[PDB]
C-alpha cells in the first residue's frame, strides 16, 4: 500500500485525561537539510586565538540530524499544563510512541539566480534509534531544536554532533570516533513510514506541590519539650561567673528546640539584585561565579543543587547562576537585557532547602577554654549529612523533561540538576539523514570518493505520544489553595497566543508547584 | 573501562542552549555602570552552559612531584599529610576517596 | 430568526487546510520557525447528500390552491438558467408557503 499518492499517516495532536493518567499526543511538520555536504568533520577549539582553557573541546560533527522532544511544551498545551499543575501532587511519564510519516524528499536546482524545487520520488531518508545507547547522548543538554510549543510552527531538525576526550585542541588515544552509518538504519521513500514504542523505567513522581510547613516548625506550638538544652553559661550581673543552666524549649523559644531533621545540602552562590544600584559596580559575572573544577577546567554550576532562590520579602535577589533563565520571544543570543529574559523562582522549597545565596549554618572553629573565647565559622558548602531532607528543582512548561544518568560506578540522588526525571535508559536518540544522491560520475573510473551530489532536503510530519501517570491530591486542607490563573484584566494580546504578526509566545515561566502538602 | 567523554563535555557541540546565564554585570567603557545582561551558551562558551551533573566528592590532598627539585625542601610527609581524626588519633588517609592522580 | 431549523447539535464544521511544505532550509541549524514555503493550492470535488422527510398535504379544500408557477409569457432569458455570457442567476426569491391550512 506504500505509494506516492497515498498518505502514510494522519495528524494526531490532542490530550485525553483518563482517571489517574493523561495521554498527550502532538504532531509537527519538520524540514531536514543536508548537513556538512554528507561529510563527517572533526571540530575542536584550542587555547590559541584568545580562547580560554575552560572552553577547549574536541569532537566531530555528523551529516545526521536528530529528533528531540525534551521540553514539556512539546507535549502539553498551556491549558493542559494548568489542569496538571492545579489538580495533581505529582506525575511521571509511563510510555512513549513515536512516528515519522508523509515524507517528501525534494531536490533544489539553481542557475542564473533562478531556484527550482522538485520532488525526487526515488530518494530515501535513513532513520534509526539508538536502542542500546551506543552513541554519545546529547539530548539532556537543553539545546535548541525541540518540537515547537505551538503546533502550527514548522521547525528545522538540528544537526547531530558529539564531543570526546581532548588535551587542548588535540585528541588523545582514548578519544573515540563514531560513524553513524556503521549502525543498521531503516531507509524510507515517500510511501514508507517509521514507528517505534518506548516504555519509561520506573521513576519517582515529580513533586508538584509546595510544603505548608517548614522543617524548623514541625513542632506542636502548645506544648513544651521534655528535653533540655544549655540556656545560659554565665551568671547575670556586673561581674559574672561561669555556670551551666538548662531550659526546656517551648513555644516561647522554638529555635532552641531539639529536632529530628536537617535542611538539604548547599553549595553557596552569589547574590544578584534586579535593582541595579544595589549590585556592586564591577563585572563579577564570571569572576565571582560559583564554579567546579574538573581536570584543570573551571565550569559554572548552572543551576546547581536545588536551593531556594531567596528568603522572605526579598524577590529582587536571585543566585547568579543558580536558577533557570528563559528568553522572551525574539530574544537574541548574546548580551541580552534583563527585560527579555524570564527568571524562574524556586522559593517554594525554602521550607526544606537552604537559600542559595546564604550560608548553610555555623560550626565551631576551635576548642573553648577560659583563655579562649568561642569562635564559630560559616558553612558555605555542605555535603549530605544523616537527617537531611530536600526538594528537587521544579519543572517548567518550557523546561527539560528528562536526562540520562551517566553510566558510572556511583551517583548520589541522580535527579537532573536542570530538572525533570533522571533515567538510566532514557528515550533513545532518533537520528535521521538524507541519503546522498550523487551527480553524474566522470564516465572514466576514478578511485576518489564522489564529492558531487544533488542538492536535496526532506520534509514530513513527526508525531509523538506520551502517557503520563498522575498522583491525585488527597489534601484535607480547609481553606482554598493557590492556583495558576490567567489575569482577568484586559490586554492587547492573549497570553499564550499568536499576535497580530502571527508569532506565538510564552509570556512567563509556569512552574508545577501550587498545591500544598504537610511535611 | 575509561570514559570516552567527560561530564563537562556531554553537550552537543553544534547547537546552542535555549537557556540563559548572566553574562555581564557591567557596561564596558571608561566609567562602567551596573547592568544585567544575559547570553545563551553555545559551542563558543562551553564552560558557561547549564549542566545536569556534578563531579564526584573530594577530600583534598598534597601534591608531590617525582622531579625532586620541584618539591619543597622540608620533610612534609607526615606534617603536610591529609589525615582524619578519630578518638584523639590522627591517621593518614591512604589512599582515600577516589580522585584523579593528576590533570592533563 | 433568519429562518430554518434550530439545532443543538447541528451538522459539524468541516475544516480543510493545505499542509505547509517548506522550501529548502539553510543547511546550518536555526531555531527560528521556517517562514519560507512552497506556494500551493488544492482542488477537488465535494459531494453532499441530505435525506429530507416530507409532510403530505391532507387538505379537503374544494377550490384550487395557489401554486408557484413560471411565467408563460416570452422573455429574452429563461428564469433560473444561464445567459448569453454563461452566468447563472436566480431572478426572484422563492418562499415555501403556498398551500393552505385551517387554524
Tab-separated table of N, CA, C and O in Angstrom, chain A residues 54-57 61 66 71 136 140-144 159-166 276-277 281-285 292 295 297-300 302 325 327 331-333 335-336 338 341 400 403-404 406-407 414 417-418, chain B residues 1-26 32-55 103-104:
chain	number	residue	atom	x	y	z
A	54	UNK	N	39.181	26.797	29.618
A	54	UNK	CA	37.931	26.210	30.070
A	54	UNK	C	37.022	25.834	28.916
A	54	UNK	O	36.190	24.936	29.062
A	55	UNK	N	37.153	26.508	27.782
A	55	UNK	CA	36.263	26.322	26.651
A	55	UNK	C	36.821	25.397	25.579
A	55	UNK	O	36.196	25.253	24.527
A	56	UNK	N	37.978	24.786	25.804
A	56	UNK	CA	38.559	23.896	24.808
A	56	UNK	C	37.713	22.642	24.639
A	56	UNK	O	37.105	22.155	25.592
A	57	UNK	N	37.677	22.115	23.415
A	57	UNK	CA	36.947	20.884	23.149
A	57	UNK	C	37.515	20.196	21.918
A	57	UNK	O	38.273	20.782	21.148
A	61	UNK	N	31.395	16.587	13.986
A	61	UNK	CA	30.071	16.953	13.503
A	61	UNK	C	29.667	15.982	12.406
A	61	UNK	O	30.480	15.639	11.547
A	66	UNK	N	18.753	14.971	14.221
A	66	UNK	CA	18.114	14.186	15.263
A	66	UNK	C	16.819	14.843	15.716
A	66	UNK	O	16.675	16.065	15.710
A	71	UNK	N	11.297	19.066	25.929
A	71	UNK	CA	10.687	20.162	26.660
A	71	UNK	C	9.212	19.856	26.833
A	71	UNK	O	8.600	19.242	25.957
A	136	UNK	N	27.253	8.759	21.917
A	136	UNK	CA	27.176	9.884	22.849
A	136	UNK	C	25.767	10.451	22.879
A	136	UNK	O	25.156	10.694	21.840
A	140	UNK	N	20.176	15.479	26.834
A	140	UNK	CA	19.920	16.070	28.130
A	140	UNK	C	20.644	17.372	28.385
A	140	UNK	O	20.758	17.809	29.531
A	141	UNK	N	21.156	17.995	27.330
A	141	UNK	CA	21.967	19.197	27.447
A	141	UNK	C	21.176	20.478	27.231
A	141	UNK	O	21.772	21.556	27.187
A	142	UNK	N	19.859	20.383	27.069
A	142	UNK	CA	18.980	21.548	26.968
A	142	UNK	C	19.320	22.416	25.764
A	142	UNK	O	19.431	23.636	25.868
A	143	UNK	N	19.467	21.790	24.605
A	143	UNK	CA	19.739	22.532	23.390
A	143	UNK	C	18.453	22.945	22.699
A	143	UNK	O	17.348	22.579	23.094
A	144	UNK	N	18.622	23.692	21.624
A	144	UNK	CA	17.520	24.142	20.800
A	144	UNK	C	17.158	23.021	19.829
A	144	UNK	O	17.794	21.967	19.800
A	159	UNK	N	21.357	19.572	13.748
A	159	UNK	CA	22.457	18.709	13.353
A	159	UNK	C	23.006	17.969	14.559
A	159	UNK	O	23.064	18.501	15.667
A	160	UNK	N	23.423	16.731	14.337
A	160	UNK	CA	23.963	15.904	15.401
A	160	UNK	C	25.477	16.031	15.431
A	160	UNK	O	26.124	16.134	14.388
A	161	UNK	N	26.029	16.038	16.634
A	161	UNK	CA	27.461	16.106	16.824
A	161	UNK	C	27.751	15.723	18.253
A	161	UNK	O	26.857	15.699	19.100
A	162	UNK	N	29.013	15.417	18.517
A	162	UNK	CA	29.391	14.942	19.835
A	162	UNK	C	30.825	15.340	20.119
A	162	UNK	O	31.596	15.670	19.219
A	163	UNK	N	31.169	15.302	21.397
A	163	UNK	CA	32.499	15.627	21.873
A	163	UNK	C	33.090	14.405	22.546
A	163	UNK	O	32.373	13.503	22.974
A	164	UNK	N	34.410	14.389	22.636
A	164	UNK	CA	35.116	13.331	23.324
A	164	UNK	C	36.338	13.930	23.995
A	164	UNK	O	36.498	15.149	24.064
A	165	UNK	N	37.191	13.055	24.507
A	165	UNK	CA	38.356	13.484	25.262
A	165	UNK	C	39.272	14.359	24.423
A	165	UNK	O	39.373	14.195	23.208
A	166	UNK	N	39.940	15.299	25.083
A	166	UNK	CA	40.894	16.159	24.407
A	166	UNK	C	41.962	16.621	25.377
A	166	UNK	O	41.764	16.626	26.592
A	276	UNK	N	19.429	47.597	39.966
A	276	UNK	CA	20.822	47.652	39.544
A	276	UNK	C	21.694	48.348	40.576
A	276	UNK	O	22.790	47.873	40.887
A	277	UNK	N	21.212	49.450	41.145
A	277	UNK	CA	22.045	50.257	42.029
A	277	UNK	C	22.525	49.468	43.239
A	277	UNK	O	23.504	49.853	43.887
A	281	UNK	N	29.571	47.632	41.603
A	281	UNK	CA	29.960	48.140	40.295
A	281	UNK	C	31.286	47.483	39.915
A	281	UNK	O	32.370	47.862	40.361
A	282	UNK	N	31.167	46.511	39.019
A	282	UNK	CA	32.247	45.663	38.541
A	282	UNK	C	31.594	44.596	37.684
A	282	UNK	O	30.375	44.422	37.719
A	283	UNK	N	32.400	43.866	36.924
A	283	UNK	CA	31.832	42.727	36.214
A	283	UNK	C	32.231	41.494	37.010
A	283	UNK	O	33.342	40.980	36.899
A	284	UNK	N	31.295	41.010	37.822
A	284	UNK	CA	31.512	39.870	38.697
A	284	UNK	C	30.887	38.595	38.158
A	284	UNK	O	30.932	37.564	38.832
A	285	UNK	N	30.279	38.657	36.976
A	285	UNK	CA	29.560	37.533	36.393
A	285	UNK	C	30.391	36.259	36.415
A	285	UNK	O	29.994	35.270	37.032
A	292	UNK	N	32.851	24.706	39.479
A	292	UNK	CA	33.523	23.470	39.845
A	292	UNK	C	34.683	23.238	38.894
A	292	UNK	O	34.676	23.717	37.760
A	295	UNK	N	39.560	18.472	35.895
A	295	UNK	CA	40.709	18.297	35.004
A	295	UNK	C	41.234	19.645	34.511
A	295	UNK	O	41.385	19.879	33.313
A	297	UNK	N	39.890	22.428	34.167
A	297	UNK	CA	38.877	23.325	33.632
A	297	UNK	C	37.939	23.759	34.744
A	297	UNK	O	37.538	22.945	35.576
A	298	UNK	N	37.579	25.035	34.743
A	298	UNK	CA	36.542	25.554	35.619
A	298	UNK	C	35.275	25.702	34.799
A	298	UNK	O	35.311	26.250	33.696
A	299	UNK	N	34.162	25.213	35.322
A	299	UNK	CA	32.880	25.402	34.671
A	299	UNK	C	31.855	25.878	35.682
A	299	UNK	O	31.817	25.407	36.819
A	300	UNK	N	31.039	26.825	35.243
A	300	UNK	CA	29.976	27.380	36.062
A	300	UNK	C	29.047	26.272	36.537
A	300	UNK	O	28.789	25.312	35.809
A	302	UNK	N	25.566	25.595	36.796
A	302	UNK	CA	24.343	26.149	36.282
A	302	UNK	C	23.286	25.063	36.175
A	302	UNK	O	23.448	24.145	35.386
A	325	UNK	N	16.780	30.251	33.385
A	325	UNK	CA	16.529	31.528	32.735
A	325	UNK	C	16.026	31.272	31.326
A	325	UNK	O	16.738	30.684	30.510
A	327	UNK	N	14.217	32.893	27.729
A	327	UNK	CA	14.076	34.122	26.991
A	327	UNK	C	12.651	34.360	26.538
A	327	UNK	O	11.881	33.436	26.299
A	331	UNK	N	14.162	37.021	21.688
A	331	UNK	CA	15.367	37.442	22.383
A	331	UNK	C	16.597	36.976	21.622
A	331	UNK	O	16.600	35.906	21.010
A	332	UNK	N	17.645	37.786	21.659
A	332	UNK	CA	18.851	37.453	20.942
A	332	UNK	C	19.673	36.396	21.648
A	332	UNK	O	19.294	35.846	22.680
A	333	UNK	N	20.822	36.093	21.050
A	333	UNK	CA	21.741	35.132	21.646
A	333	UNK	C	22.622	35.766	22.715
A	333	UNK	O	22.818	35.182	23.785
A	335	UNK	N	24.338	38.905	25.164
A	335	UNK	CA	24.279	40.150	25.929
A	335	UNK	C	22.904	40.796	25.852
A	335	UNK	O	22.751	41.951	25.458
A	336	UNK	N	21.892	40.028	26.232
A	336	UNK	CA	20.521	40.492	26.165
A	336	UNK	C	20.120	41.107	27.499
A	336	UNK	O	20.505	40.630	28.570
A	338	UNK	N	17.985	42.472	30.803
A	338	UNK	CA	17.169	41.754	31.776
A	338	UNK	C	15.704	41.707	31.365
A	338	UNK	O	14.950	40.849	31.830
A	341	UNK	N	14.778	38.415	29.254
A	341	UNK	CA	14.850	37.121	29.926
A	341	UNK	C	13.680	36.931	30.882
A	341	UNK	O	13.061	37.902	31.324
A	400	UNK	N	13.223	21.232	30.552
A	400	UNK	CA	13.568	19.881	30.088
A	400	UNK	C	12.793	18.798	30.826
A	400	UNK	O	12.542	18.905	32.024
A	403	UNK	N	16.714	13.523	31.631
A	403	UNK	CA	18.136	13.466	31.347
A	403	UNK	C	18.602	12.031	31.495
A	403	UNK	O	17.936	11.210	32.126
A	404	UNK	N	19.754	11.733	30.913
A	404	UNK	CA	20.349	10.412	31.027
A	404	UNK	C	21.303	10.392	32.209
A	404	UNK	O	22.264	11.164	32.246
A	406	UNK	N	24.435	9.442	33.876
A	406	UNK	CA	25.686	8.907	33.336
A	406	UNK	C	25.939	7.504	33.849
A	406	UNK	O	25.466	7.116	34.915
A	407	UNK	N	26.690	6.731	33.080
A	407	UNK	CA	26.967	5.357	33.463
A	407	UNK	C	28.273	5.355	34.240
A	407	UNK	O	29.347	5.517	33.660
A	414	UNK	N	20.316	10.713	41.874
A	414	UNK	CA	20.559	11.065	40.472
A	414	UNK	C	19.398	11.774	39.802
A	414	UNK	O	18.910	11.333	38.760
A	417	UNK	N	19.999	18.184	37.530
A	417	UNK	CA	20.059	19.466	38.212
A	417	UNK	C	19.301	20.563	37.488
A	417	UNK	O	18.882	21.527	38.135
A	418	UNK	N	19.115	20.453	36.175
A	418	UNK	CA	18.247	21.404	35.498
A	418	UNK	C	16.782	21.116	35.774
A	418	UNK	O	15.983	22.047	35.891
B	1	UNK	N	37.117	-0.027	32.378
B	1	UNK	CA	36.958	0.824	31.216
B	1	UNK	C	37.271	2.239	31.653
B	1	UNK	O	37.248	2.556	32.841
B	2	UNK	N	37.532	3.093	30.676
B	2	UNK	CA	37.673	4.519	30.904
B	2	UNK	C	36.552	5.215	30.153
B	2	UNK	O	35.989	4.647	29.220
B	3	UNK	N	36.197	6.419	30.571
B	3	UNK	CA	35.176	7.135	29.828
B	3	UNK	C	35.788	7.831	28.626
B	3	UNK	O	36.878	8.398	28.702
B	4	UNK	N	35.080	7.768	27.505
B	4	UNK	CA	35.448	8.484	26.299
B	4	UNK	C	34.832	9.870	26.256
B	4	UNK	O	34.966	10.568	25.250
B	5	UNK	N	34.161	10.275	27.328
B	5	UNK	CA	33.644	11.621	27.495
B	5	UNK	C	33.915	12.087	28.914
B	5	UNK	O	34.270	11.296	29.787
B	6	UNK	N	33.740	13.385	29.140
B	6	UNK	CA	33.833	13.979	30.464
B	6	UNK	C	32.531	14.699	30.777
B	6	UNK	O	31.837	15.150	29.865
B	7	UNK	N	32.190	14.784	32.064
B	7	UNK	CA	30.937	15.404	32.484
B	7	UNK	C	30.707	16.766	31.863
B	7	UNK	O	29.600	17.070	31.413
B	8	UNK	N	31.730	17.599	31.859
B	8	UNK	CA	31.581	18.953	31.364
B	8	UNK	C	31.429	19.029	29.854
B	8	UNK	O	31.113	20.101	29.345
B	9	UNK	N	31.722	17.955	29.122
B	9	UNK	CA	31.619	17.938	27.665
B	9	UNK	C	30.436	17.145	27.100
B	9	UNK	O	30.429	16.852	25.905
B	10	UNK	N	29.466	16.736	27.918
B	10	UNK	CA	28.396	15.861	27.431
B	10	UNK	C	27.495	16.498	26.375
B	10	UNK	O	26.638	15.807	25.821
B	11	UNK	N	27.654	17.782	26.091
B	11	UNK	CA	26.764	18.544	25.225
B	11	UNK	C	26.941	18.213	23.745
B	11	UNK	O	27.924	17.605	23.319
B	12	UNK	N	25.949	18.626	22.962
B	12	UNK	CA	26.064	18.708	21.509
B	12	UNK	C	26.885	19.935	21.130
B	12	UNK	O	26.465	21.061	21.402
B	13	UNK	N	28.051	19.761	20.507
B	13	UNK	CA	28.894	20.914	20.178
B	13	UNK	C	28.340	21.813	19.091
B	13	UNK	O	28.896	22.889	18.875
B	14	UNK	N	27.329	21.395	18.346
B	14	UNK	CA	26.881	22.186	17.214
B	14	UNK	C	25.733	23.129	17.529
B	14	UNK	O	25.444	24.009	16.714
B	15	UNK	N	25.084	22.993	18.677
B	15	UNK	CA	23.801	23.638	18.921
B	15	UNK	C	23.905	24.503	20.167
B	15	UNK	O	24.592	24.145	21.128
B	16	UNK	N	23.234	25.651	20.139
B	16	UNK	CA	23.122	26.494	21.319
B	16	UNK	C	22.105	25.926	22.296
B	16	UNK	O	21.252	25.114	21.940
B	17	UNK	N	22.211	26.358	23.545
B	17	UNK	CA	21.181	26.080	24.530
B	17	UNK	C	20.054	27.093	24.442
B	17	UNK	O	20.262	28.254	24.091
B	18	UNK	N	18.847	26.642	24.758
B	18	UNK	CA	17.717	27.549	24.855
B	18	UNK	C	17.673	28.283	26.183
B	18	UNK	O	16.836	29.171	26.356
B	19	UNK	N	18.546	27.937	27.118
B	19	UNK	CA	18.597	28.616	28.397
B	19	UNK	C	19.569	29.783	28.343
B	19	UNK	O	20.312	29.959	27.380
B	20	UNK	N	19.590	30.553	29.422
B	20	UNK	CA	20.423	31.736	29.534
B	20	UNK	C	21.229	31.694	30.819
B	20	UNK	O	20.923	30.938	31.742
B	21	UNK	N	22.269	32.514	30.858
B	21	UNK	CA	23.081	32.709	32.041
B	21	UNK	C	23.400	34.189	32.141
B	21	UNK	O	23.154	34.955	31.212
B	22	UNK	N	23.967	34.591	33.269
B	22	UNK	CA	24.276	36.001	33.470
B	22	UNK	C	25.662	36.211	32.893
B	22	UNK	O	26.667	35.790	33.459
B	23	UNK	N	25.715	36.872	31.738
B	23	UNK	CA	26.986	37.023	31.047
B	23	UNK	C	27.767	38.218	31.565
B	23	UNK	O	28.984	38.134	31.754
B	24	UNK	N	27.098	39.344	31.774
B	24	UNK	CA	27.798	40.585	32.045
B	24	UNK	C	27.035	41.419	33.061
B	24	UNK	O	25.841	41.677	32.888
B	25	UNK	N	27.718	41.822	34.131
B	25	UNK	CA	27.120	42.674	35.149
B	25	UNK	C	27.499	44.147	35.057
B	25	UNK	O	27.080	44.920	35.920
B	26	UNK	N	28.280	44.561	34.069
B	26	UNK	CA	28.716	45.948	33.990
B	26	UNK	C	28.844	46.368	32.537
B	26	UNK	O	29.236	45.566	31.687
B	32	UNK	N	32.082	52.420	33.930
B	32	UNK	CA	31.005	51.481	33.724
B	32	UNK	C	29.928	51.632	34.767
B	32	UNK	O	30.201	52.041	35.896
B	33	UNK	N	28.697	51.313	34.398
B	33	UNK	CA	27.584	51.297	35.328
B	33	UNK	C	26.983	49.902	35.348
B	33	UNK	O	27.018	49.186	34.343
B	34	UNK	N	26.463	49.509	36.502
B	34	UNK	CA	25.955	48.156	36.655
B	34	UNK	C	24.757	47.909	35.748
B	34	UNK	O	23.958	48.807	35.481
B	35	UNK	N	24.665	46.680	35.251
B	35	UNK	CA	23.585	46.219	34.396
B	35	UNK	C	23.528	44.708	34.507
B	35	UNK	O	24.425	44.084	35.069
B	36	UNK	N	22.447	44.127	34.009
B	36	UNK	CA	22.324	42.677	33.923
B	36	UNK	C	22.122	42.306	32.463
B	36	UNK	O	21.079	42.615	31.883
B	37	UNK	N	23.109	41.643	31.872
B	37	UNK	CA	22.996	41.135	30.514
B	37	UNK	C	23.120	39.622	30.524
B	37	UNK	O	23.861	39.056	31.328
B	38	UNK	N	22.403	38.977	29.620
B	38	UNK	CA	22.269	37.532	29.595
B	38	UNK	C	22.638	37.007	28.218
B	38	UNK	O	22.461	37.702	27.216
B	39	UNK	N	23.156	35.785	28.171
B	39	UNK	CA	23.553	35.163	26.920
B	39	UNK	C	23.161	33.694	26.924
B	39	UNK	O	23.020	33.073	27.975
B	40	UNK	N	22.974	33.148	25.730
B	40	UNK	CA	22.804	31.713	25.544
B	40	UNK	C	24.162	31.096	25.252
B	40	UNK	O	24.856	31.527	24.328
B	41	UNK	N	24.533	30.090	26.031
B	41	UNK	CA	25.840	29.479	25.874
B	41	UNK	C	25.792	28.417	24.788
B	41	UNK	O	25.027	27.455	24.875
B	42	UNK	N	26.590	28.613	23.749
B	42	UNK	CA	26.696	27.659	22.681
B	42	UNK	C	28.034	26.963	22.686
B	42	UNK	O	28.707	26.862	23.711
B	43	UNK	N	28.440	26.461	21.523
B	43	UNK	CA	29.777	25.862	21.420
B	43	UNK	C	30.897	26.827	21.735
B	43	UNK	O	31.960	26.407	22.202
B	44	UNK	N	30.687	28.116	21.477
B	44	UNK	CA	31.738	29.095	21.711
B	44	UNK	C	32.141	29.125	23.178
B	44	UNK	O	33.332	29.108	23.502
B	45	UNK	N	31.163	29.177	24.082
B	45	UNK	CA	31.404	29.119	25.521
B	45	UNK	C	30.761	27.839	26.053
B	45	UNK	O	29.555	27.789	26.276
B	46	UNK	N	31.577	26.811	26.290
B	46	UNK	CA	31.053	25.578	26.871
B	46	UNK	C	31.048	25.619	28.390
B	46	UNK	O	30.196	24.996	29.027
B	47	UNK	N	32.001	26.326	28.989
B	47	UNK	CA	32.111	26.327	30.441
B	47	UNK	C	30.887	26.952	31.092
B	47	UNK	O	30.582	26.670	32.255
B	48	UNK	N	30.175	27.808	30.363
B	48	UNK	CA	29.089	28.560	30.976
B	48	UNK	C	27.736	27.907	30.744
B	48	UNK	O	26.713	28.456	31.157
B	49	UNK	N	27.699	26.749	30.093
B	49	UNK	CA	26.418	26.119	29.818
B	49	UNK	C	25.827	25.532	31.088
B	49	UNK	O	26.534	25.288	32.066
B	50	UNK	N	24.519	25.315	31.064
B	50	UNK	CA	23.857	24.618	32.150
B	50	UNK	C	24.104	23.125	32.024
B	50	UNK	O	24.225	22.594	30.920
B	51	UNK	N	24.194	22.441	33.160
B	51	UNK	CA	24.527	21.027	33.173
B	51	UNK	C	23.697	20.304	34.217
B	51	UNK	O	23.210	20.916	35.169
B	52	UNK	N	23.525	18.999	34.020
B	52	UNK	CA	22.676	18.222	34.913
B	52	UNK	C	23.464	17.565	36.033
B	52	UNK	O	22.870	17.037	36.976
B	53	UNK	N	24.786	17.573	35.961
B	53	UNK	CA	25.545	16.702	36.839
B	53	UNK	C	26.759	17.426	37.397
B	53	UNK	O	27.179	18.467	36.893
B	54	UNK	N	27.311	16.860	38.460
B	54	UNK	CA	28.445	17.392	39.197
B	54	UNK	C	29.513	16.325	39.344
B	54	UNK	O	29.209	15.128	39.364
B	55	UNK	N	30.774	16.725	39.451
B	55	UNK	CA	31.839	15.750	39.687
B	55	UNK	C	31.735	15.139	41.072
B	55	UNK	O	31.099	15.681	41.972
B	103	UNK	N	46.096	16.063	36.463
B	103	UNK	CA	45.377	16.566	35.306
B	103	UNK	C	46.215	16.375	34.045
B	103	UNK	O	47.230	15.676	34.041
B	104	UNK	N	45.771	16.989	32.952
B	104	UNK	CA	46.445	16.830	31.671
B	104	UNK	C	47.887	17.315	31.730
B	104	UNK	O	48.191	18.351	32.323
